[PDB]
Coordinates of C-alpha atoms in Angstrom, one line a residue:
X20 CA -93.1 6.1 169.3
X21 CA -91.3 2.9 170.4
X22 CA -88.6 0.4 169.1
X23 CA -87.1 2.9 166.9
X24 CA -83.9 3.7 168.5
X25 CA -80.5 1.3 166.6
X26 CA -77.9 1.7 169.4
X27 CA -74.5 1.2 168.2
X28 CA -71.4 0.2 171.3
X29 CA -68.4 -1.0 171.3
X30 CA -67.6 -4.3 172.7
X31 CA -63.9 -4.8 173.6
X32 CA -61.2 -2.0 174.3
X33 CA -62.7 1.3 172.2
X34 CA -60.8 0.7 169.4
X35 CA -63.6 -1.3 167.1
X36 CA -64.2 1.7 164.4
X37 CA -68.2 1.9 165.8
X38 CA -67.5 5.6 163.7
X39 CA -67.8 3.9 160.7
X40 CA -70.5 1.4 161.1
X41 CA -72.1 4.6 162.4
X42 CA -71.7 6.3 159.2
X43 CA -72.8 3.3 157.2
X44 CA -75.9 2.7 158.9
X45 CA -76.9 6.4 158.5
X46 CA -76.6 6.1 155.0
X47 CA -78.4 3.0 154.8
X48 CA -81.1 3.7 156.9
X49 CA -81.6 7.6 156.6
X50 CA -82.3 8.0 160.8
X51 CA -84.4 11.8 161.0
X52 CA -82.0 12.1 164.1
X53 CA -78.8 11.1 165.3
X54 CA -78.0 11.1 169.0
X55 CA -74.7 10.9 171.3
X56 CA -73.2 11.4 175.0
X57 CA -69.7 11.7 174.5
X58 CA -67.1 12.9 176.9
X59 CA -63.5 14.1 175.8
X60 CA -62.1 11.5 173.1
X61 CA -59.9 11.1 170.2
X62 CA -62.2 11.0 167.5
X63 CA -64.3 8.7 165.7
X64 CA -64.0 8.5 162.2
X65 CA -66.1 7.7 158.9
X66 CA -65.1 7.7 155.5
X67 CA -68.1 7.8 152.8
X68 CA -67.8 6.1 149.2
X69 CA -66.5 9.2 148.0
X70 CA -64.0 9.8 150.1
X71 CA -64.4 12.5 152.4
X72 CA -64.0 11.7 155.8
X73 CA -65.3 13.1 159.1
X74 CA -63.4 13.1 162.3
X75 CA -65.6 13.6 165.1
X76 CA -65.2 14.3 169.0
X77 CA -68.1 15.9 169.8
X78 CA -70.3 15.4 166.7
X79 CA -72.0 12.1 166.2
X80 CA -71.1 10.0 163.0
X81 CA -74.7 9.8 161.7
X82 CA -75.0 13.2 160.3
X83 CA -74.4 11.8 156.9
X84 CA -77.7 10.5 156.9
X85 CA -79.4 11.7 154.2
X86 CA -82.6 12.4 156.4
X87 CA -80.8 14.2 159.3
X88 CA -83.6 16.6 160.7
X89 CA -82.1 16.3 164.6
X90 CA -78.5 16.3 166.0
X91 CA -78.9 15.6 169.6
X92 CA -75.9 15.7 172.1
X93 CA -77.0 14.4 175.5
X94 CA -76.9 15.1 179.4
X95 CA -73.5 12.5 179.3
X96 CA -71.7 15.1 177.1
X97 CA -68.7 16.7 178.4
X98 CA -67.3 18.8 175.4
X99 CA -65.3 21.4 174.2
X100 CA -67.1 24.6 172.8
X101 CA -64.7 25.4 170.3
X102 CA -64.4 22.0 169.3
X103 CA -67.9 21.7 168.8
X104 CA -68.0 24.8 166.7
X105 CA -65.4 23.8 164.2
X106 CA -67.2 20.2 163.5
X107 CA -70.2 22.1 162.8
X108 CA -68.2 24.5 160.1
X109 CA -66.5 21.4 158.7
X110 CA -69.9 20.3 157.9
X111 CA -71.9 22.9 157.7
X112 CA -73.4 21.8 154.2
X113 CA -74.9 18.9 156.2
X114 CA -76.0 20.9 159.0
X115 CA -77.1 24.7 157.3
X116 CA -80.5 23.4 156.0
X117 CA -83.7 22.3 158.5
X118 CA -81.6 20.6 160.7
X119 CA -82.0 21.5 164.5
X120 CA -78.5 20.8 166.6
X121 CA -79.8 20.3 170.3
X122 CA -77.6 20.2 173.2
X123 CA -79.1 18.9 176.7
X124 CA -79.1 21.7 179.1
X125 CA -77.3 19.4 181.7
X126 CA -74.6 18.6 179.7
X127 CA -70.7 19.9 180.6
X128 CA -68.9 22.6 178.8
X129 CA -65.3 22.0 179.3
X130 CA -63.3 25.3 180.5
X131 CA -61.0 26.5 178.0
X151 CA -59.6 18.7 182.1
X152 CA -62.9 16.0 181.5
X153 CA -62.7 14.6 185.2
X154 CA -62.7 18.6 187.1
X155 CA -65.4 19.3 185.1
X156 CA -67.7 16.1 185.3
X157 CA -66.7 16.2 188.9
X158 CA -67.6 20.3 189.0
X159 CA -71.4 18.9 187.6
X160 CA -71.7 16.6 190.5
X161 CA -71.1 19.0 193.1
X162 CA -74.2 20.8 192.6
X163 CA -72.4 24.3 193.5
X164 CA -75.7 26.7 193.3
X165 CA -73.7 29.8 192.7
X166 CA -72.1 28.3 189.8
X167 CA -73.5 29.2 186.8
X168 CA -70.6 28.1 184.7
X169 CA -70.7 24.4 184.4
X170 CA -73.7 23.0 182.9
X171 CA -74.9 24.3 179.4
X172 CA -78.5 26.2 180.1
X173 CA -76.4 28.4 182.2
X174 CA -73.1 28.9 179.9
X175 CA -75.2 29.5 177.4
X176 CA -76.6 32.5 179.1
X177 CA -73.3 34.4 178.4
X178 CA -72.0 32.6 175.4
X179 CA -74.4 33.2 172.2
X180 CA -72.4 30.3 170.2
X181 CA -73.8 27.5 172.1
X182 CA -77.1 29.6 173.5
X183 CA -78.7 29.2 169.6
X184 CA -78.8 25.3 170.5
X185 CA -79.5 24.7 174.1
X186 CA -82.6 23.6 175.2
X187 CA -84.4 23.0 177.6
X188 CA -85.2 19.4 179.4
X189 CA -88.8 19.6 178.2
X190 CA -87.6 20.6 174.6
X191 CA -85.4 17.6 174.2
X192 CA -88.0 15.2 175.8
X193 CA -90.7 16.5 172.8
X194 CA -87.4 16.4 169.9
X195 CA -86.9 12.6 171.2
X196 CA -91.3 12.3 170.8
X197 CA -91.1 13.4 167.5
X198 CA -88.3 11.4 165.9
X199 CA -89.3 8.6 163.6
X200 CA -85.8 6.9 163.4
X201 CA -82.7 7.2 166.4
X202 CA -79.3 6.4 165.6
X203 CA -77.5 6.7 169.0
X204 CA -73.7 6.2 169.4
X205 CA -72.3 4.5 172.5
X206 CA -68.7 6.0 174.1
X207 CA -65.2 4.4 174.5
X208 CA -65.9 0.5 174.8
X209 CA -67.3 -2.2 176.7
X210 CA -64.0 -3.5 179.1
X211 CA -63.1 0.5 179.7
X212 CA -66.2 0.6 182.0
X213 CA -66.0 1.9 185.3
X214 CA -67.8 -1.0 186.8
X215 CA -65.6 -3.9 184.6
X216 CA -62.7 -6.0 186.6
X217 CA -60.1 -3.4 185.1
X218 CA -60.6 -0.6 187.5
X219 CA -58.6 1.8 188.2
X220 CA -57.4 1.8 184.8
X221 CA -60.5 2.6 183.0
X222 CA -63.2 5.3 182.0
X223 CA -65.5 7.4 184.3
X224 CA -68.5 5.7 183.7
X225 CA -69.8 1.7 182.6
X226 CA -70.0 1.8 178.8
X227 CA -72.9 0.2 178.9
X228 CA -76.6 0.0 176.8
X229 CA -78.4 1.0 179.7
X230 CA -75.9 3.7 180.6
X231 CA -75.9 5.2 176.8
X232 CA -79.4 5.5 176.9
X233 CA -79.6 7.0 180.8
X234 CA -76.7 9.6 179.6
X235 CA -79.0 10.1 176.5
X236 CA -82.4 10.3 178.4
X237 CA -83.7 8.0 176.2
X238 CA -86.6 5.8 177.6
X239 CA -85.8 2.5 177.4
X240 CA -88.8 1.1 175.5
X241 CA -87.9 3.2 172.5
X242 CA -84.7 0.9 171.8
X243 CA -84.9 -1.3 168.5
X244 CA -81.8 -2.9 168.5
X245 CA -78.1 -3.2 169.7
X246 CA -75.3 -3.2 166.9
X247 CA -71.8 -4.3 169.1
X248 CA -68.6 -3.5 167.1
X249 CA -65.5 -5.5 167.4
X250 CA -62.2 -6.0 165.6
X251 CA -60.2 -9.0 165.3
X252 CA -56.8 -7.8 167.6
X253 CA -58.1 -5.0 170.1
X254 CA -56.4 -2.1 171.1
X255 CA -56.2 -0.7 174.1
X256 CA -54.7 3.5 173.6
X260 CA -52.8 1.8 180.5
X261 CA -55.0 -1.2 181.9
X262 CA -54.4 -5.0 181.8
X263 CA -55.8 -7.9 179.7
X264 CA -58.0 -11.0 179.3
X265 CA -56.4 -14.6 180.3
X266 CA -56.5 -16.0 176.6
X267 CA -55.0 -12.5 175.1
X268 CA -51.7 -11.2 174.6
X269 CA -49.8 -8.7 173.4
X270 CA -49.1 -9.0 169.8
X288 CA -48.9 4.5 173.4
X289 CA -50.9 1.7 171.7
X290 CA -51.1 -1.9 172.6
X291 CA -52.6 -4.7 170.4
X292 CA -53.8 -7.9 171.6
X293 CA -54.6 -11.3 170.2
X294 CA -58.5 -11.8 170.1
X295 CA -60.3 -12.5 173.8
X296 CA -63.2 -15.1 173.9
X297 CA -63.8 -14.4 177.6
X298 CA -63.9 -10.7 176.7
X299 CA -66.1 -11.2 174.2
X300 CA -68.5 -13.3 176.2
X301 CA -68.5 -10.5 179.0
X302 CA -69.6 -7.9 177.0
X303 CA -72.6 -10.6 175.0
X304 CA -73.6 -11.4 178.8
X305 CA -74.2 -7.5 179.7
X306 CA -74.5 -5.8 176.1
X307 CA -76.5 -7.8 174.0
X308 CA -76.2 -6.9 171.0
X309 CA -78.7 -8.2 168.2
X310 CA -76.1 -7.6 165.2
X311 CA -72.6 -7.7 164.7
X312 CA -70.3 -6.1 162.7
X313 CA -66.7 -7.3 162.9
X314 CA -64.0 -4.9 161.9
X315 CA -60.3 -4.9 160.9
X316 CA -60.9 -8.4 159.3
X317 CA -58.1 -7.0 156.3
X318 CA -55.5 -7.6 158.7
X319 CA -55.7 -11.4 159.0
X320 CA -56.4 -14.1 156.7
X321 CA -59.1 -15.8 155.8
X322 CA -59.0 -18.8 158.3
X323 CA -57.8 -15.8 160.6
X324 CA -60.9 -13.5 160.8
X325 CA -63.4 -16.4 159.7
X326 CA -62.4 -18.2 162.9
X327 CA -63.3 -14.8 165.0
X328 CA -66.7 -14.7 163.4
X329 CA -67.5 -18.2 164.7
X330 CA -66.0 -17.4 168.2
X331 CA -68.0 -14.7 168.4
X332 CA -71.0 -16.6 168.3
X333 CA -70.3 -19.3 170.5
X334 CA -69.6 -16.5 173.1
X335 CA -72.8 -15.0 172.4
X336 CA -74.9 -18.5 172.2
X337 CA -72.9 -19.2 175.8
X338 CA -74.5 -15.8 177.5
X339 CA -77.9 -16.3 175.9
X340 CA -77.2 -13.8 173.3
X341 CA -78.8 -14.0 169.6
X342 CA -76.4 -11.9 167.9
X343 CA -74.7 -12.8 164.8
X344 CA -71.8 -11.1 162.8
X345 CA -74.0 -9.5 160.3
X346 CA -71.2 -7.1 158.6
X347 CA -67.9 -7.2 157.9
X348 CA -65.1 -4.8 157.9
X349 CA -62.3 -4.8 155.3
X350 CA -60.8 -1.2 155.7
X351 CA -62.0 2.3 157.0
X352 CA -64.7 3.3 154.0
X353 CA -68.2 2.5 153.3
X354 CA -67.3 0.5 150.6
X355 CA -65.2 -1.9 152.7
X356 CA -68.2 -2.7 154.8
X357 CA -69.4 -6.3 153.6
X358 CA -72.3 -8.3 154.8
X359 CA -71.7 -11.7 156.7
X360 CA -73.7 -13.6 154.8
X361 CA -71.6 -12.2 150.8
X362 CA -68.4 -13.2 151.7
X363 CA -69.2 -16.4 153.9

């Protein structure tokens, strides 16, 4: 009932690919259910060994899974009804057969921006029954066949065996980080994942932080030791890094984009990553590699080094 929930977050600008270490972990690990919060983004993407690939807003990664039985989008969500309709056609295969898709009464249905209508949640208007989803649902059938209620998704949570829960945006794009004003509308945090999730937190197993060698930032300034190398790269941060060991701390790593530099290149990351975690009393190691946007190009640590 406990320690079963494998968090995955991103730890620099939200440009890691957490979508595909998503994907591969569901495949590796067959989670019963698969969990997000996600507020208006530009999609997270997973390619499988196939090569079909799966570009989700609204949808978390994990649904590959081969044991899906849950697909939980949480109190956090702020989404798009017909967005959420067309991911679930584009894979309805996965999702036809005894799976339940559950959507937090609490979260926001965007009318057909993200910030009016978060904000329109947290004014608490009582004659306005068209914000949150319990009461949209009431009038639209397509989202009333998987809203619950609070109680409903407190027992779905109760009787998971294994949680893959995907983070939002990226660790320095929190609300609460040095960078305000120029970042998101709330910390991108573990604890705040798992509060927009209403997840309890004794049920988390473990952290997985996703980075890539030269983050992106897609608008906000920078670390002290990064530069620049709309869509800005940078050179690789240590300080950034250590901030988000000190506050996220992960338990694994996996290390992205590594095909873009060589081998002293990305190899030198991997062991900077780990001082910065040893220097904020974090354990994590880089445990996978990525070498390109499919399953197949995900690589453990310990293979190739």
């Amino acid at each position: 009932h406990m320690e079963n929930v494998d968090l995955v977050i991103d730890l620099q600008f939200g440009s890691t690919g957490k979508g595909l270490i998503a994907g591969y972990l569901a495949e590796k690990n067959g989670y019963d259910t698969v969990i997000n919060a996600n507020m208006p983004n530009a999609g997270h993407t997973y390619i499988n060994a196939e090569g079909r690939k799966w570009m989700h807003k609204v949808l978390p990664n994990g649904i590959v899974s081969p044991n899906l039985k849950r697909v939980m989008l949480g109190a956090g969500s702020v989404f798009s009804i017909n967005r959420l309709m067309e991911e679930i056609e584009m894979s309805k295969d996965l999702l036809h057969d005894k799976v339940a898709i559950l959507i937090h009464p609490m979260a926001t249905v965007l009318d057909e921006g993200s910030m009016a209508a978060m904000v329109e949640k947290l004014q608490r208007d009582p004659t306005n029954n068209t914000i949150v989803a319990r009461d949209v649902a009431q009038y639209d059938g397509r989202i009333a066949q998987y809203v619950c209620t609070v109680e409903e998704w407190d027992m779905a949570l109760m009787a998971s065996e294994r949680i893959l829960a995907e983070g939002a945006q990226g660790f320095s794009l929190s609300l609460n980080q040095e960078f305000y004003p120029y970042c998101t509308s709330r910390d991108c945090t573990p604890a705040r994942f798992l509060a927009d999730m209403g997840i309890p937190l004794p049920m988390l197993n473990k952290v997985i932080g996703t980075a890539r060698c030269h983050p992106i930032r897609v608008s906000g300034g920078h670390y002290p030791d990064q530069e620049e190398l709309v869509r800005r790269v940078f050179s690789f941060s240590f300080i950034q890094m250590q901030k988000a060991m000190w506050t996220c701390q992960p338990d694994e790593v996996f290390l992205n984009f590594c095909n873009y530099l060589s081998p002293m290149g990305w190899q030198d990351i991997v062991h900077q990553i780990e001082v910065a975690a040893q220097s904020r009393y974090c354990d994590a190691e880089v445990k996978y590699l990525g070498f390109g946007p499919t399953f197949n190009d995900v690589e453990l640590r310990e293979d190739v080094m």
